[PDB]
Amino acid sequence: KWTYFGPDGENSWSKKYPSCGGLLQSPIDLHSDILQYDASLTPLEFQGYNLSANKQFLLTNNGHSVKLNLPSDMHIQGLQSRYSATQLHLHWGNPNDPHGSEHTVSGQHFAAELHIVHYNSDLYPDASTASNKSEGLAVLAVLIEMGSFNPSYDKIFSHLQHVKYKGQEAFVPGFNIEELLPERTAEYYRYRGSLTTPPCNPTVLWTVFRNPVQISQEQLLALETALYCTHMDDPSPREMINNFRQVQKFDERLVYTSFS
Amino acid sequence: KWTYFGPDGENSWSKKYPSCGGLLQSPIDLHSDILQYDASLTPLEFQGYNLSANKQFLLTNNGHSVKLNLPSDMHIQGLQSRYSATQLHLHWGNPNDPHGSEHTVSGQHFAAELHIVHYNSDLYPDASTASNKSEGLAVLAVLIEMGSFNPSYDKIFSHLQHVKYKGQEAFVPGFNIEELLPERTAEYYRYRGSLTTPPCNPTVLWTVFRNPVQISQEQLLALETALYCTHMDDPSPREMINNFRQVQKFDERLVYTSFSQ
Ligand SMILES: NS(=O)(=O)c1c(F)c(F)c(S(=O)(=O)CCO)c(N[C@H]2CCCc3ccccc32)c1F
Ligand SMILES: NS(=O)(=O)c1c(F)c(F)c(S(=O)(=O)CCO)c(N[C@H]2CCCc3ccccc32)c1F
Ligand SMILES: [Zn+2]
Ligand SMILES: [Zn+2]
């Protein structure tokens, strides 16, 4: 049903998914006037991120992004509850306007953005069940800019040709997912928000790292051009591009920062 | 009953107004990747903008906005038909966040925005009719930044405290509307877009001037605290603040500029 363009684009999500028109919607612009240092924001610890290279993890194209399934022994420690990983995926723009992060910083997009989705496994049995519940989800967001080639992101990007079309899947050998995180992960923005796709439930604790990672121009172009939303046999293919939500209003609220 | 905040705010407009989820939506972020210089975009001429000071024009709060009615003898020359003025209005933020323009430039909001709405009077007998026809409307947008006191904007703002509530009306003596436009009107952005409120019709030819005008902090504060969306007797009053739509996706679309650099 829902898409990022045309008649079924983000202004019409709230028909079928009423939370998309409710409170606490993400993503948002991160800008200095709404930032406030909170010394309670200590470093997260990423446990079980070094995935067994003797295990394979499913990469899918689901017609909205590309997702990598992650094992529930992978978790974040440092939040009030343990949050266990469920999947990671990316958002991007298109080669004519290669500025497709979801969050913006001082009004500026980054080229792309990686999200590592986790759910409160102390309170809930699985990610779906947690996804509409209080304290349900925690997402780590990495902002991505063009720069150097990044061998670690290429661990995912080398498999994109096998998940070109909707419904397709590939197996990815385990690698250390912490290699996808930026420098100085102690430095981050934190706020309470929502899923950025339907059903837009306002159940996400967001952690957006302050520092971006770099990928090369070729890796960015590959991510922007490799994938389609549509099934292989669809006579009207659509490229998977511009798969980010516009920023939401965020008034009389703060975004907490772990850095001054 | 649509609003800019809460359950009836902008992500819900398309439930009742389908064009709000349609094509060609405004406003947009004006940034380099989507600009293209077009030498055919020659200067507009503003005719009959100098409204007589002995005449008076109706200022009205309709609950979603405050508009000044303008006479159909006021025209823009330069488009592919004559477009005659119908009304102007503003968009703004709030006292704790004076960043309420609709268009943004390279990701930055301006303090407020003035829209002067025109309709194709060669083709249509009124703006209402024009409003659902392709390029039936042409809106001029002036980006407003916090700066010096502006006596020309004050000719409007000094009356707003007199139209505080929905349905209220006041008369504003004529003045030269061109005093609301910025320097170097020849430099503008041009694109096909939409109304930025419901019903979000995709029928507007937008001209956004490159250069902002300034109004003062005190003018912004008065603008941001003077008006209500509700009637004088409403037991649930709602301040008219933050009355701007977020910028829209704009892909496949280009914005044409009359300036190259
Ligand atoms: N930006 S975001 O908000 O992090 C974000 C996405 F962008 C996004 F596309 C998805 S997806 O399934 O629809 C495609 C895989 O990526 C998700 N998963 C959510 C929504 C569906 C229900 C559910 C159930 C359990 C865990 C997560 C989710 C998502 F969380
Ligand atoms: N930002 S914008 O897109 O320029 C813009 C507004 F912001 C704005 F609030 C209004 S409104 O106050 O009339 C309430 C809107 O339903 C308008 N007027 C349009 C829309 C309704 C039909 C009509 C008929 C004659 C003249 C103008 C208009 C508007 F054009
Ligand atoms: Zn995401
Ligand atoms: Zn307007």
Side-chain angles (χ1 to χ4, degrees), chain B:
Chain B
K1 82 178 286 265
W2 63 262
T3 62
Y4 290 96
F5 180 67
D8 301 311
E10 73 199 271
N11 287 0
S12 296
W13 294 353
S14 71
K15 300 173 190 186
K16 295 176 153 195
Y17 298 99
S19 292
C20 299
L23 292 174
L24 296 188
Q25 297 292 284
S26 294
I28 61 175
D29 178 55
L30 300 166
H31 62 287
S32 60
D33 313 64
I34 49 83
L35 302 180
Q36 181 171 298
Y37 173 61
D38 182 347
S40 75
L41 293 177
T42 55
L44 293 175
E45 287 185 302
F46 310 101
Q47 302 230 253
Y49 276 48
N50 187 1
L51 301 184
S52 177
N54 298 340
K55 287 174 176 211
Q56 67 202 349
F57 296 90
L58 191 72
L59 186 77
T60 299
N61 182 335
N62 62 26
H64 290 294
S65 160
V66 62
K67 71 187 186 141
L68 177 66
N69 279 2
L70 290 170
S72 58
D73 56 15
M74 176 170 164
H75 302 285
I76 46 194
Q77 176 174 301
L79 307 167
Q80 265 148 195
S81 297
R82 168 140 95 187
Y83 281 80
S84 294
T86 187
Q87 54 109 309
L88 56 77
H89 62 269
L90 295 102
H91 303 268
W92 60 82
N94 65 80
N96 297 301
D97 188 11
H99 301 281
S101 74
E102 301 215 285
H103 292 92
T104 64
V105 175
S106 298
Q108 314 266 59
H109 279 270
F110 288 78
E113 189 167 329
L114 170 77
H115 290 158
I116 310 180
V117 185
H118 300 68
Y119 69 103
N120 184 336
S121 50
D122 285 342
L123 304 184
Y124 310 113
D126 59 275
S128 288
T129 295
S131 75
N132 43 34
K133 311 273 137 54
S134 203
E135 319 169 18
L137 306 169
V139 178
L140 306 180
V142 182
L143 301 169
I144 293 171
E145 67 189 3
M146 191 178 290
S148 293
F149 181 80
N150 194 308
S152 300
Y153 277 83
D154 228 53
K155 297 172 173 169
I156 295 162
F157 293 161
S158 70
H159 300 275
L160 290 181
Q161 72 275 26
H162 308 306
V163 294
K164 297 185 53 84
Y165 304 104
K166 184 178 175 190
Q168 293 192 321
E169 297 179 341
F171 276 121
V172 178
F175 67 100
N176 180 14
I177 305 306
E178 203 169 353
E179 298 171 0
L180 300 183
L181 305 180
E183 291 201 314
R184 291 180 302 284
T185 53
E187 299 185 42
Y188 57 84
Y189 307 91
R190 166 73 46 75
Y191 77 97
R192 283 177 203 294
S194 75
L195 300 178
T196 64
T197 55
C200 301
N201 296 340
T203 51
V204 173
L205 190 58
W206 279 96
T207 300
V208 181
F209 295 107
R210 188 192 190 173
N211 296 132
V213 298
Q214 298 184 353
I215 69 180
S216 68
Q217 190 293 141
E218 296 81 359
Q219 287 180 295
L220 278 159
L221 184 62
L223 175 64
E224 299 154 355
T225 60
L227 304 168
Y228 286 84
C229 293
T230 40
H231 288 120
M232 187 168 187
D233 69 357
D234 196 310
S236 207
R238 289 179 293 111
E239 287 169 309
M240 186 182 295
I241 51 173
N242 309 316
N243 64 325
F244 64 96
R245 197 184 192 188
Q246 299 293 96
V247 294
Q248 301 296 294
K249 291 275 196 299
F250 187 82
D251 304 297
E252 329 318 314
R253 308 160 69 202
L254 301 187
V255 176
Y256 302 91
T257 54
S258 68
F259 56 93
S260 58
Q261 58 202 314

Side-chain angles (χ1 to χ4, degrees), chain A residues 89-91 102 115 196 206:
Chain A
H89 60 270
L90 292 96
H91 301 271
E102 305 216 285
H115 290 161
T196 66
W206 279 98

Side-chain angles (χ1 to χ4, degrees), chain A residues 4 10-11 13 25-28 101-102 104 109 196 242 244-249, chain B residues 11 27-29 246-251:
Chain A
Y4 291 94
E10 66 195 275
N11 286 353
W13 294 354
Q25 295 294 285
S26 291
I28 60 173
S101 69
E102 305 216 285
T104 61
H109 281 83
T196 66
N242 301 323
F244 61 96
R245 196 190 192 178
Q246 298 294 93
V247 293
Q248 309 293 296
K249 284 181 165 56
Chain B
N11 287 0
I28 61 175
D29 178 55
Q246 299 293 96
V247 294
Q248 301 296 294
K249 291 275 196 299
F250 187 82
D251 304 297

